[PDB]
Design a protein around this motif. Structure first.
Motif, PDB file in Angstrom:
ATOM      1  N   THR A   1       0.828  -1.215   0.000  1.00 47.07           N
ATOM      2  CA  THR A   1       0.000   0.000   0.000  1.00 47.07           C
ATOM      3  C   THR A   1       0.857   1.257   0.000  1.00 47.07           C
ATOM      4  N   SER A   2       2.065   1.210   0.560  1.00 48.43           N
ATOM      5  CA  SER A   2       2.982   2.350   0.551  1.00 48.43           C
ATOM      6  C   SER A   2       3.466   2.649  -0.864  1.00 48.43           C
TER       7      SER A   2
ATOM      8  N   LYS B   1       0.542   4.280  -2.732  1.00 50.23           N
ATOM      9  CA  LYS B   1       0.307   5.620  -2.162  1.00 50.23           C
ATOM     10  C   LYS B   1       1.349   6.631  -2.649  1.00 50.23           C
TER      11      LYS B   1
ATOM     12  N   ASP C   1      -7.979   1.657   3.854  1.00 55.13           N
ATOM     13  CA  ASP C   1      -8.191   3.101   3.811  1.00 55.13           C
ATOM     14  C   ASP C   1      -8.936   3.514   2.535  1.00 55.13           C
TER      15      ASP C   1
ATOM     16  N   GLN D   1      -9.405   3.782  14.124  1.00 55.38           N
ATOM     17  CA  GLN D   1      -8.603   4.578  13.201  1.00 55.38           C
ATOM     18  C   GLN D   1      -8.892   4.201  11.753  1.00 55.38           C
TER      19      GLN D   1
ATOM     20  N   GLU E   1     -16.689   8.047   6.742  1.00 55.13           N
ATOM     21  CA  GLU E   1     -16.225   9.316   7.298  1.00 55.13           C
ATOM     22  C   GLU E   1     -17.230  10.440   7.067  1.00 55.13           C
TER      23      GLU E   1
ATOM     24  N   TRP F   1     -18.469  15.109  15.051  1.00 56.59           N
ATOM     25  CA  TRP F   1     -17.890  15.282  16.376  1.00 56.59           C
ATOM     26  C   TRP F   1     -18.993  15.575  17.383  1.00 56.59           C
TER      27      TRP F   1
ATOM     28  N   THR G   1       1.430   9.920   5.741  1.00 54.51           N
ATOM     29  CA  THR G   1       1.541   8.719   6.575  1.00 54.51           C
ATOM     30  C   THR G   1       0.542   7.610   6.191  1.00 54.51           C
ATOM     31  N   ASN G   2       0.767   6.396   6.691  1.00 53.51           N
ATOM     32  CA  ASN G   2      -0.219   5.314   6.715  1.00 53.51           C
ATOM     33  C   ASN G   2      -0.575   4.940   8.157  1.00 53.51           C
ATOM     34  N   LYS G   3      -1.861   5.041   8.509  1.00 49.21           N
ATOM     35  CA  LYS G   3      -2.398   4.748   9.840  1.00 49.21           C
ATOM     36  C   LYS G   3      -1.603   5.418  10.980  1.00 49.21           C
TER      37      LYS G   3
ATOM     38  N   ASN H   1      -2.477  11.002   9.619  1.00 52.04           N
ATOM     39  CA  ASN H   1      -3.895  10.902   9.997  1.00 52.04           C
ATOM     40  C   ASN H   1      -4.159  10.180  11.342  1.00 52.04           C
TER      41      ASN H   1
ATOM     42  N   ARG I   1      -5.149  18.458  16.375  1.00 51.85           N
ATOM     43  CA  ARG I   1      -5.961  17.653  15.475  1.00 51.85           C
ATOM     44  C   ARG I   1      -6.937  18.563  14.747  1.00 51.85           C
TER      45      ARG I   1
ATOM     46  N   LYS J   1     -14.384  19.683   8.325  1.00 56.45           N
ATOM     47  CA  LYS J   1     -14.379  18.785   7.181  1.00 56.45           C
ATOM     48  C   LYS J   1     -14.988  19.489   5.977  1.00 56.45           C
TER      49      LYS J   1
ATOM     50  N   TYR K   1     -18.353  22.165  11.582  1.00 53.96           N
ATOM     51  CA  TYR K   1     -17.275  21.267  11.198  1.00 53.96           C
ATOM     52  C   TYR K   1     -17.439  20.711   9.790  1.00 53.96           C
TER      53      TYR K   1
END
Lengths: 863, 110, 137
Positions: free
Chosen positions: A658-659, A662, A687, A808, A816, A821, B7-9, B32, B52, B56, B60
């Motif tokens: 996946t890297s 990406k 993801d 996560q 998402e 929130w 990044t990843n995770k 993230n 953070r 969105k 928010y």
């Protein structure tokens, strides 16, 4: 003329001395154009002056010494309100024979002139001396003659001069005298403007005109006591006097002649810029439509503006070539446009429209420049001189820029008629040595060397003074000494080394092949900035890279077009899938910013998909299309994407990192990426960002000349290129070039099925989770994480689940959009419901191809 | 400026890397999800700031920036003006000292 | 005229645009202060650019120095013109013949390279590269 001006301004010590004196103190006496203080005008330098009498004597002294040597000078003197009198009689001759005009006739004419002056003027009482001069044209051209009559001693007003001039037009005696001389119209011999125009200083002339030569000078002494006694005698020994000083109308300190008291901006630009003069010489070569038609006129004014910022007066002048279009546009549009192309384009157009005048002008320019160097340094040539004349001679074919290695590199503009590689026309090619500049210096430059050789020989032949002949003999000698050196290898290498500075055009390398809208093809350069064109002529676009395929406009009736379309339809029979695949592949020729999309196109083998990929790769060529190893995905090779537009891959069940994907879909990424296989890949990620940009499609049709031969066929490649560019144009017109907007329900469904089959989270969301506007139950990141835990344990495999990592993963997943929130700063589920075991969808809860009769490739008017 | 731009995770552990973090460039890291290491709040961890993002784009939720406005030279000139202006304000107020600026939200999240 | 002569004259003539300092590689490097009205890349105004070879100096010696050669030419020609004693006139004629013999050499490539190499020492400004770009303000 300027060459003779040069020659005459060196071996003629007097000419150089006069110029030095004028430059060193007479410049402080300069006057702005239109000033009345002007008395001496330089028709060469365009500068007007105001000299005091004390320095005027020295100037006239310098004008006399220069004149006696035969120098060609174009001075003028300003005669105004109160000055001497001048008369011009441009006789028109019935026959080519020149009339004698013996001294007795001239004396009679002087008598008649003084008779008219006596009748038509008031003169002082007493003893006065009036000096008369008769300068005659050296030779009678085509039955056309003339002479001048100068009266510096007399001083009257302009009204008096005009009255006298009008009076002479009615003189029967002068008319009858001219009658027997062969004058066609004696009454028109006099110029009524003789009292107005400033007159040539003695010894000067007009351009391409011989000076008026003094025939004889008469002396008249008048007294008031006896008005009817008119003595006339020739002046004896005139050649010993300062003739320019004596003949000056404004001068008042003459040794013999005594005072008897009774737009420029364009010219300045032209004279201060030889290059602007050359442009003006070649601008008249353009056809009339280049100043009346707005596109051509706009191109011309843009080229002038880009050339430099001071070419405005030429832009005004060129726009002013048509009266009506200077006012229907023109005089305001010029300001607008003044507020990509340069003189090379104008130069080429001038060659195209008036080739022979073009050739004559350029050869004369070469001769003038080269001879200016030769005249400047006694015929000794060094490297920089020849470097400059070559740059002026072939500055439109080579560009030199320092590469990353710090070495100067020579580029050639390839023109038809030269040996070359295939697909190398109308572009730039890298050359280790300017080989053509080595041959050209020896061969074509020799012609300019010759032209000056015969120039010097001809000037030797002409009858000149002995010192001039000797000096020419020395100059020629030094010249053939310096002539053979252009064949010497060391000399030629030095000339190239010096010319590397003149031919230097900074930023050529970094502006090379930057445009994604221009493409290098076999027959020229392809253009896609505007729909629909091929550049197959001279142009300023810096194209170096190229592919060997020739480009042709879309011809549907072509057999190869039909054959390739049939193969395409057979390979992908689905209208939506075929259209989407073709619009996606149509971007392969585009080397700009991308949409960050990658495809995993699967197939059962022998389906033609590998054939299609090979066809695309060969058509785009190795410069624009590259093969990428699949080994990078399962793990220097990243640099292979530089400047490309197409990438592809070609074992069982590879593992995809996946890297790597990406980082790949992130210099910039400007390549279209596709993955081809026969085994379904395994993707170990969840993801949504990674998955949403990915596609999956499977080839189904199996086939039971194309594979090995027709792909090598150049005509097939050209037809496929036409196909591909036509889909690109169609995609740009229809959807503004966006590939996401094309609807492909089959491909989208296949991609979703593959994603669900590979990712457990997505299928869980689509099956066990159903969006519900009524059911807004708080499925907090924790609770839903647990429900996934039992889902996986009770459906796939028993495994230990961690709340944090699953939360996560859910944060960046497709859900998402539904996570908001809570005021407790905790992620919660809003407007959604979870289906438990054996649970069905409730009301209000929803889960989270017109075949054309005409040809599918044809324009479909259904947006 | 040095950006760890993706990044990843959850990010990897960074104890030796933060020992190295304890140099004339500003640093920022753009994951993230949370990093696999942290330290004592007055040991090597004293230098870490955390924040953070909340809003969105789709208070928010909010409606060319990524592909068009980013490459406009005038936009870059305006952003340069903004940066130099904020530098001027920080220099005049806090004398260039960044710790004197009060950031309760960042401190709390950290 | 020999290399160091024209090197000193050029240094006087354009000492305000070029700086030479040897980098860690042991080779002399030319720097040029970019002024408006010249070809350049974007944003390269009023700043020092690293030049592999001083193209501007090479062209300058050919064009602008020629003006000074010309001025000396008419200067000595004027002294020839004025009435002087015979030995003085012969001296000036010999100086002339020498002048023109040495005049064309500024267009020669090897001569131009020698002049550049000689001027590399005059244009040298120690510690330039080390202090380059050091101010953070």
């Amino acid at each position: 003329d300027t060459i003779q001006l040069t020659a005459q301004r060196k071996y003629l010590a007097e000419v150089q001395a006069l110029e030095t004196l004028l430059a060193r103190e007479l410049s402080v006496f300069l006057t702005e154009p239109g000033s009345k203080k002007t008395n001496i005008i330089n028709r060469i330098t365009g500068k007007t002056y105001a000299l005091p009498s004390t320095e005027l004597l020295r100037f006239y002294e310098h004008l006399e010494q220069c004149r006696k040597q035969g120098a060609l000078m174009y001075f003028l003197e300003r005669q105004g309100t109160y000055s001497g009198l001048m008369l011009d009689y441009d006789l028109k001759l019935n026959t080519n024979a020149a009339p004698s005009l013996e001294s007795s006739v001239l004396s009679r004419l002087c008598h008649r002139i003084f008779v008219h002056i006596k009748n038509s003027s008031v003169l002082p009482e007493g003893s006065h001396k009036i000096h008369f001069f008769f300068t005659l044209k050296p030779e009678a051209v085509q039955g056309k003659y003339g002479f001048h009559v100068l009266i510096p001693g007399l001083k009257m007003a302009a009204s008096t001069k005009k009255s006298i001039i009008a009076s002479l037009q009615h003189d029967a005696t002068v008319q009858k005298i001219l009658h027997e001389q062969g004058v066609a119209n004696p009454e028109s011999c006099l110029d009524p403007h003789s009292a107005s125009v400033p007159s040539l200083l003695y010894g000067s002339s007009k351009l391409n005109h011989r000076p008026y030569q003094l025939k004889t000078g008469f002396e008249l002494v008048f007294d008031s006591s006896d008005p009817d006694y008119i003595p006339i005698h020739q002046i004896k020994n005139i050649e010993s006097y300062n003739l320019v000083s004596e003949l000056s109308l404004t001068n008042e300190q003459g040794s013999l002649v005594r005072p008897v008291y009774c737009d420029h901006s364009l010219s300045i630009l032209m004279l201060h810029d030889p290059e602007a003069r050359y442009l003006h010489k070649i601008l008249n070569l353009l056809p009339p439509e280049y100043y009346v038609e707005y596109p051509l006129w706009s191109n011309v004014v843009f080229a002038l503006a880009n050339t430099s910022a001071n070419y405005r007066p030429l832009a005004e002048w060129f726009s002013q070539k048509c009266p009506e279009k200077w006012n229907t546009g023109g005089k305001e549009k010029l300001e607008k446009l003044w507020n990509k192309i340069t003189k090379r384009s104008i130069m080429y157009w001038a060659h195209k429209h008036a080739p022979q005048q073009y050739k004559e002008i350029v050869e004369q320019g070469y001769f003038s420049i080269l001879a200016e160097y030769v005249y400047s340094y006694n015929g000794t040539l060094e490297h920089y001189m020849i470097a400059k004349v070559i740059y002026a001679m072939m500055g439109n074919k080579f560009v030199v820029d320092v590469d990353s290695n710090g070495k100067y590199v020579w580029f050639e503009f390839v023109l038809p008629g030269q040996p070359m590689n295939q697909g190398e026309i109308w572009k730039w090619r890298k050359e280790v040595n300017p080989d053509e500049l080595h041959i050209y210096i020896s061969e074509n430059f020799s012609r300019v060397m010759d032209r000056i050789t015969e120039h010097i020989k001809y000037h030797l032949s002409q009858p000149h003074e002995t010192n001039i002949l000797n000096y020419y003999k020395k100059l020629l000698k030094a010249f053939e000494r310096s002539k053979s050196k252009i064949f010497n290898d060391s000399f030629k290498k030095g000339v190239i080394r010096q010319a590397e500075f003149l031919f230097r055009q900074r930023s050529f390398i970094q502006t090379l092949d930057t445009n994604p809208y221009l493409l290098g093809v076999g027959n020229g350069v392809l253009s896609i900035e505007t729909i629909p064109k091929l550049i197959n002529h001279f142009h300023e676009h810096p194209i170096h890279q190229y592919t060997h395929i020739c480009y042709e406009p879309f011809n549907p009736e072509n057999p190869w077009t039909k054959l390739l379309l049939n193969a395409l339809q057979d390979i992908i029979p689905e209208l939506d899938a075929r259209l989407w695949i073709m619009f996606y592949l149509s971007t392969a020729i585009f080397r700009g910013l991308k949409e960050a999309l990658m495809l995993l196109w699967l197939g059962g083998g022998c389906n033609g998909k590998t054939f299609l990929m090979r066809l695309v790769a060969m058509v785009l060529g190795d410069h624009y299309a590259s093969k990428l190893n699949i080994s990078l995905l399962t793990s220097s090779a990243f640099m292979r994407l530089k400047g490309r537009g197409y990438g592809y891959f070609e074992n069982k069940s590879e593992i995809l990192n996946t890297s790597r994907l990406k980082e790949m879909v992130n210099f910039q990424m400007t390549a279209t990426m596709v993955a081809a296989s026969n085994y379904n890949f395994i993707i170990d990620t969840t993801d949504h960002g990674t998955w949403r940009r990915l596609r999956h499609y499977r080839s189904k049709v199996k086939f039971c000349r194309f594979i090995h031969e027709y792909i090598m066929d150049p005509n097939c490649q050209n037809a496929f290129f036409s196909i591909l560019v036509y889909f690109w144009e169609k995609l740009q017109k229809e959807y503004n070039g966006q590939i996401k907007k094309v609807f492909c329900p089959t491909i989208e469904s296949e991609t979703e099925a593959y994603r669900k089959s590979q990712d457990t989270l997505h299928r869980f969301i689509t099956e066990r989770v159903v969006e519900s506007p009524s059911a807004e139950t708080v499925y907090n990141l924790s609770e839903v994480v647990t429900a996934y835990a039992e889902w996986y344990n009770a459906n796939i495999n028993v495994k230990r689940h961690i709340a944090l990592e699953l939360s996560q993963e859910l944060e960046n997943s497709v859900l998402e959009k539904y996570l908001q929130w809570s005021p407790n700063k905790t992620r919660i589920l809003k407007g959604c419901r979870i289906l438990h075991k054996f649970e069905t969808l409730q009301p209000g809860e929803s889960y989270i191809i017109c075949e054309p009769k005409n040809k599918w490739w044809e324009w479909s008017p259904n947006p | 400026y040095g950006y760890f731009e993706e990044t990843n995770k959850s990010e990897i552990l960074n104890t030796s890397r933060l020992k190295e973090m304890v140099m004339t460039a500003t640093m920022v890291a753009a994951s993230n999800y949370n990093f696999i290491i942290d330290t004592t709040d007055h040991g090597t961890w004293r230098r870490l700031r955390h924040y953070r993002s909340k809003v969105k784009f789709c208070s928010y939720e909010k409606k060319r920036f990524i592909h068009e406005y980013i490459m406009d030279p005038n936009c870059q000139n305006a952003f340069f003006s903004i940066l130099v202006y904020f530098w001027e304000k920080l220099q005049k107020e806090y004398n260039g000292q960044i710790k004197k600026v009060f950031c309760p939200t960042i401190e709390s999240e950290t």
